[PDB]
Amino acid sequence: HRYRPGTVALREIRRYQKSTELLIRKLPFQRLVREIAQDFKTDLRFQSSAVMALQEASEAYLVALFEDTNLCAIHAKRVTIMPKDIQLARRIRGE
Amino acid sequence: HRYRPGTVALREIRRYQKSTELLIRKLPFQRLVREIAQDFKTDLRFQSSAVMALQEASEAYLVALFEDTNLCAIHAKRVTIMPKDIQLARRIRGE
Amino acid sequence: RAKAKTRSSRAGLQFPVGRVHRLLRKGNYAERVGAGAPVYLAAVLEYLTAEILELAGNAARDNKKTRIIPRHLQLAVRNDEELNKLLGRVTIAQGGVLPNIQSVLL
Amino acid sequence: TRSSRAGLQFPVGRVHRLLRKGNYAERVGAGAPVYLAAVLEYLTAEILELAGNAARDNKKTRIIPRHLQLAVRNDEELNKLLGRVTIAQGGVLPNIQSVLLP
Amino acid sequence: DNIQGITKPAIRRLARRGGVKRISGLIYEETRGVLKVFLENVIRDAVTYTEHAKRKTVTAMDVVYALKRQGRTLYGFG
Amino acid sequence: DNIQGITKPAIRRLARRGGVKRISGLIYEETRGVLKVFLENVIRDAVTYTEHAKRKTVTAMDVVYALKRQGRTLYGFG
Amino acid sequence: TRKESYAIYVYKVLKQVHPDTGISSKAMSIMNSFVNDVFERIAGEASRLAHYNKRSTITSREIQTAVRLLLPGELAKHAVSEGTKAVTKYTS
Amino acid sequence: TRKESYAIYVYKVLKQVHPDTGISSKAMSIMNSFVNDVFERIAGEASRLAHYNKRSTITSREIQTAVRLLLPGELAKHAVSEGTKAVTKYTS
DNA sequence: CACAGGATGTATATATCTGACACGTGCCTGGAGACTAGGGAGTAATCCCCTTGGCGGTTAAAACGCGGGGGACAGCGCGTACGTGCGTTTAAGCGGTGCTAGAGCTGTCTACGACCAATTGAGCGGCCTCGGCACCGGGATTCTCCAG
DNA sequence: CTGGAGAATCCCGGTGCCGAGGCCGCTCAATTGGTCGTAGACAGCTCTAGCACCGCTTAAACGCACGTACGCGCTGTCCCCCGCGTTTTAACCGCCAAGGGGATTACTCCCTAGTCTCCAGGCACGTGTCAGATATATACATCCTGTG
């Protein structure tokens, strides 16, 4: 049995719009954050709640960006988001 | 002699992007402002500078919106801005 | 003296008039704070809290829950037009998003 | 004047008064107005330098709002600092999308 | 019926300064609606500032403050 | 090379939560660049707050103040 | 150290609007940060109102004008009604 | 009634950076609003910084951190250098 | 299919003129100088908590590979609606005159808010404790899809 | 176009746990009650500028005709992204251990508010001239069609 190309994408859309849990893996994200912070100050420590706040902010930002990117892609009569959709959304936002 | 459909449009774009004067007629705009303000409080007076500030702001806003709209129209491989372009621009802006 | 009565009770308010007053005085807002400003501000805060909590309790009852969670707060805010305008640049942690699939994608 | 002691053109004393009477804190340190006047003077000097260039680029010798807008919107960091500011009589930058050209 | 005073040639000039090369005929009503909404927001806030001052005259400062409150700072009017 | 730890399935889950149905293969590198720029801005502000407090540990409050300064107020962390 | 919050008042208002509905600690944290956010918005707007009119005092009418500026429409008018009713009750 | 502005200071700075360049009254009004706006931004940031750290005083350090928070990159570092130079000279 | 040249538009000296900018004058109010008083904060020591580092086991998830279909995109044709231009109309712009509503200031004076010291109860921290929610499993219902 | 398979999701029910919710000390911040001094309400007056009107000039709006190029629908290709089964990795969870540093307390001092006096920097007001606004005629520079 095979579903056609897009049924399962819609399934994940419905599922992840019902859910609220974070979608990036915590430990890779924490290593990324600490690596990024190395360039500002050495031997820095982080509270766990600071890292969690960063992850919440990052995921909210990316989800809103993907919503705007979807509108830009649909505007060009497509269903596939492309880097140019992201660039247009971020240009309209003023980034 | 006849220019082709778009040459004079580009001439106008260059001319009006070079200049800085206001583009709406002052008396119609003033009547519009007073008519709108009638709905908020009766017998209102306006300073000339208050109307000029309203008109400056309105024209700057409309010009920036038209620039975003032109971007959204180019994204869909058109050269003609349409109400859907304006609406996409205002949606991505968050209006 | 007499029986120490709170200004919230005099105003018929649930929010604390005295604490809002002290937060205004030590908040570098003005040199002086009038007597009715904390009463008014507490009433405004109480009204906004009551609106959000009523809509969130409705959202919680719709999911057959007896306890408001961030999801119900988010559903209240994003489903209410004016609350969504007030909180437009705010992220609610663990709130998720509103269910919305563009019709062309179906 | 405190501006001469700090080596500034901006009013250290007036900035101090505006800080004290602006409801910013209970107290203002002695170095706060000096530092703030220096930063305000630096940002003013940056904009005025670029705007004088833009005035020269319009064959003008006197700065007008158009020259200020050209200055602000052509410099990247000033455009970031003034991203949501509208300069009256400033116009816009002459930008035509290349896909519209003949 | 003063919104019609913002004529089609004026909207075309605004679009030209915005860099638009070709304008659909349905753009003009859309732009009049957008401008009406913008002016309603700004003027509502300006009249709120005016009524608070117990004045009957809407001032340039009211308009500037209203523009600033909406994140649209205007320079050149105080 | 820890940015590569933000994997392709994670970006797909984020786009699914954003309602996206079909995703180009080039979206993932662009999204990594976007996330890195965002984190750079927020973390620069957070470490500035940390340095002002003369602390050596970035706190949740430093992050929340950084986000609020960038117009991204965040409820749920104090 | 003692950390103050609006939690008790939020719970009383909730028991007014929803007698049986309870609240998790995360939702209460969100409501607290929301109350703080709205306090700062209204207080800052009232502060700059008093400054615009060259006044030293934040009064009920500064708070009312701030509410009309910051709240969207029906929120603003119902909040203004509640605020003036509360000030009337307190003054009497 | 007399109305204080920043016009003479902006004008002194203009005659310093461009000895032959002038400025119109409208452009000077724009410059005045720019100075007022930047002042308000930096002072607001210094106020909030002082509040977050439970301080009563706005100092050079609060001002410097506000400048580093508000200005982008090179503008921030140069403004910081100007501020530190002025404070060192003032105390000297 | 590519230049020639003609018509059209715009950039460029050049001359008039004017009003807004730049500088000087008078004066006044707010900024500086010299103190005193007091508390905000700088500093050192200490405590405990919460951050980091390690380690091992389990399994969810990431990575990978493999059809295959469907969506992106390129090409082509057509029709209509917008651009360009032209003649007619109409109210905007400009300049003046005139009138008075109300903005803005000033002088009085009172009542309202800061402040301060004593008191006490409202709200906060801590601490149980039971029921709402998470979880797990299992079966019913709905939805998708392809084969006839 | 139906009609069953097949998968996914949802609905029910039993378990169990841990966090929401209520209660108890207690303390510190809100209330009480006066005092006072100044911020603001109010009345009167001045005069700025906003409103109203009016005649005229002409720039702009409007209405109309014509054609072309752009939007849009349709077709076809192909490749790249989705759905899914398999293997690998390292995330995750639970636990242990060390100690860095956030947070508190006490103390002490120096830095800033407050006050008063005094004066000079800065603001309002005039004024003159030169940079810029406005023609004006011209030299290009550009677009478009005919022609070779």
Q: Which of C40, E53, E52 is nearest to G60 (CA)?
A: C40
- Tokens 């004529």 map to which residue? E7
Domain count, chain G: 1
CATH number of the domain to which H32 belongs: 1.10.20.10
Residue G36 corresponds to which tokens in the numbers above? 């703080």
Could you tell me if H69 and F65 are in contact, meaning their C-beta atoms sit under 8 angstroms apart?
Answer: no
Instruction: Give the whole-angstrom CA distance, residue C94 versus residue A21.
Output: 7
Show the beta-strand stretches assigned E in D1-102: 27-28, 62-63, 85-87
Q: What is the DSSP string of chain B?
A: ----TTHHHHHHHHHHHH--S--S-HHHHHHHHHHHHHTT-TT-EE-HHHHHHHHHHHHHHHHHHHHHHHHHHHHTT-SEE-HHHHHHHHHHHT-
Distance CA G68, CA G63 (A): 9
Strand bridging mode F57-58 / E57-58: unpaired
Structure tokens at F10: 């994670």
Chains contacting C (3+ CB pairs below 8 angstroms): A, D, F, G, H
Where do the structural domains in chain F lie, given as residue ranges?
1-78
Beta pairing, strands E73-75 & E22-23: unpaired
CA F43 to chain centre: 8
Grouping H, G, I as helix, E, B as strand and the rest as coil, residue C32 is strand
Residues of F in contact with A41 (CB under 8 A): 47, 50-51
Q: Measured CA to C1', what is the nucleotide nearest C25?
A: I114
Number of separate domains in chain D: 1
Residue with tokens 């904390």: C38
Helices D12-20, H25-52: crossing angle, 10 deg rounding: 50
Torsion of CA F42, F43, F49, F50, to 10 degrees: 160
| Angle (deg, nearest 10), helices A48-75 and A26-38 | 100
Tell me which of H25, H58, H64 to substitute to probe the interface with D (most D C-beta atoms closer than 10 Å): H58
Instruction: Quickly list DSSP for A37-52.
Output: HHTT-TT-EE-HHHHH
Taking alpha carbons only, the member of E23, E37, E28 closest to residue E5 is: E28
Query: Are the C-beta atoms of G30 and C70 separated by less than 8 Å?
Result: yes
Is D84 near strand I, with its CB below 7 A from some atom of it? no
Helix (H) or strand (E) holding D51, with range, is helix D31-56
In this structure, the strands spanning G57-58 and H22-23 are unpaired
Classify D7 in phi/psi space as left (phi over 0), alpha (psi -120 to 50) or beta: left
Beta carbons of B59 and E14 less than 8 angstroms apart: yes
Query: Could you give the 3-state DSSP secondary structure of residue E25?
Result: coil
Which chain E residues are closer than 8 Å to H34 by Cβ? 75
Q: How many CB atoms lie within 10 A of CB B77?
A: 9
Which chain F residue's Cα is nearest to H64? Answer: F52
Domain containing residue H40: 1-92
CB C60 within 8 A of CB C69: yes
Q: How distant, in Å, are the alpha carbons of C50, C54, C84, G27 from that of G24? A: 17, 15, 22, 5
Domain that holds residue D10: 1-102
Take residue G92 and report the two structure tokens written for it.
């009497």
DSSP code per residue over chain H: -----SHHHHHHHHHHH-TT-EE-HHHHHHHHHHHHHHHHHHHHHHHHHHHHTT-SEE-HHHHHHHHHHHS-THHHHHHHHHHHHHHHHHH-
Residue carrying the six token digits 């621009």: B89
Angle CA C13–C19–C23, to nearest 5: 125
B and F in touch (3+ CB pairs within 8 angstroms): no
- Name the 3-class secondary structure at A1: coil
Q: Which residue has the tokens 């040459």?
A: B7
Q: Is the CB of C26 under 7 A from strand I?
A: no
Residue D91 buriedness (CB in 10 A; 0-12 / 13-18 / 19+): buried
The technique by which this structure was obtained is cryo-EM
The answer to whether some atom of strand J lies closer than 7 Å to the beta carbon of D62 is yes
Contacts of residue H84, Cβ cutoff 8 Å, sequence gap at least 6: D35, H60, H64
Structure letter (DSSP) for residue G5? -
d(CA C43, CA G79): 8
Contacts of residue D24, Cβ cutoff 8 Å, sequence gap at least 6: C28, H43, H44, H46, H47, H58
Q: Which of H92, H89, H86, H79 is nearest to H38 (CA)?
A: H79
Q: How many other C-beta atoms can be found within 10 angstroms of the C-beta atom of residue A7?
A: 9
Contact F63, A57 (CB under 8 A): yes
Q: Is the CB of A42 under 7 A from strand J?
A: no
Answer whether H49 touches F (CB < 8 Å).
Answer: yes
Long-range Cβ contact pairs of D69-73 (< 8 A, separation 24 or more) = D71/D47, D72/D47
- Rounded-to-integer distance, Cα H33 and Cα D65, Å: 12
Question: Which residue carries 């500002």 as its tokens?
Answer: A40
Q: Residue A59: in which H helix or E strand, if any? A: helix A48-75
Q: Resolution of the deposited coordinates, in angstroms?
A: 2.8
- The CA-CA-CA angle for residues A18, A24, A30, to 5°, reads 145
Partners of chain G (3+ Cβ pairs below 8 A): C, D, E, F
Count of CB atoms within 10 A of residue F72's CB? 18
- Written as six digits, the tokens of H89 are 């000279």
Q: Which residue of E has its CA nearest to G48?
A: E65
Half-sphere CA count of F4, side-chain side, radius 13 A:
1
Cα separation, B72 vs B67, in Å, equals 9
| CA E60 to chain centroid | 14
Q: Residue type at G72? A: P
Q: DSSP letter at G12?
A: H
Nucleotides of J under 7 A from a protein CB: 6-10, 19-22, 28-33, 39-41, 49-51, 60-62, 67-72, 80-85, 90-92, 100-104, 111-113, 121-124, 131-133, 143-145
Place of tokens 């070079």: B18
Closest Cα partner for D72 from H37, C101, G56, C18?
H37
Residue E69 near residue G66, CB atoms below 8 Å: no
Q: Tell me, what amino acid is at D19? A: L
**CA separation for the pair F8, F32 (Å, rounded):** 10
The residue written with tokens 């509360």 in the block is G86
Contact between residue H69 and residue F70 where contact means Cβ atoms under 8 Å apart: no
One-letter amino acid at D34 equals V
Q: Give the separation between CA A58 and CA A50, rounded to whole angstroms.
A: 12
Backbone angles phi, psi at G53, to 5 degrees: -90, 10
Cβ–Cβ < 8 Å for G33, F78 = yes
- Quickly list DSSP for C39-99: HHHHHHHHHHHHHHHHHHHHHHHHTT-SEE-HHHHHHHHHHSHHHHHHTTTEEETT-----
Where is D71: in which H helix or E strand? helix D65-74
DSSP D91: -
- Estimate the crossing angle of helix H7-17 against helix H25-52, to 10 degrees: 110
Give the closest-approach CA distance of C24 to chain H in angstroms: 13
3-state secondary structure of D27: strand
Q: At G64, which helix (H) or strand (E)?
A: helix G60-70
d(CA C35, CA C21): 9
Count CB-CB contacts under 10 A for residue B11.
Answer: 12
Asked if residue H22 lies in contact with residue D63, where contact means CB atoms within 8 angstroms, the answer is yes
* Cα D77 from Cα D33, distance rounded (Å): 24
| Pick from G33, G40, G23, C20: nearest CA to F61 | G33
Rounded distance between C-alpha atoms, residue G33 and residue F61, angstroms: 12
CA–CA dist C98, B54 (Å, integer): 36
Contact H90, D35 (CB under 8 A): no
Which of C95, C99, C104 lies at the smallest CB-CB distance from A17? C99
CB contacts < 8 A (E, G): 18
- Chains in contact with D, where contact means 3 or more Cβ–Cβ distances below 8 Å, are B, C, E, G, H
User: What domains, with CATH codes, occur in chain A?
Assistant: 1-95 (1.10.20.10)
Among candidate residues D86, C18, C97, the one with its CA nearest the CA of residue A15: C97
| Helices and strands: H and E segment counts in chain G | 4, 2
Parallel, antiparallel or unpaired: strands A80-81 and B45-46: unpaired
Per-residue DSSP letter, F23: E
How many CA within 13 A on the CB side of residue C64? 0
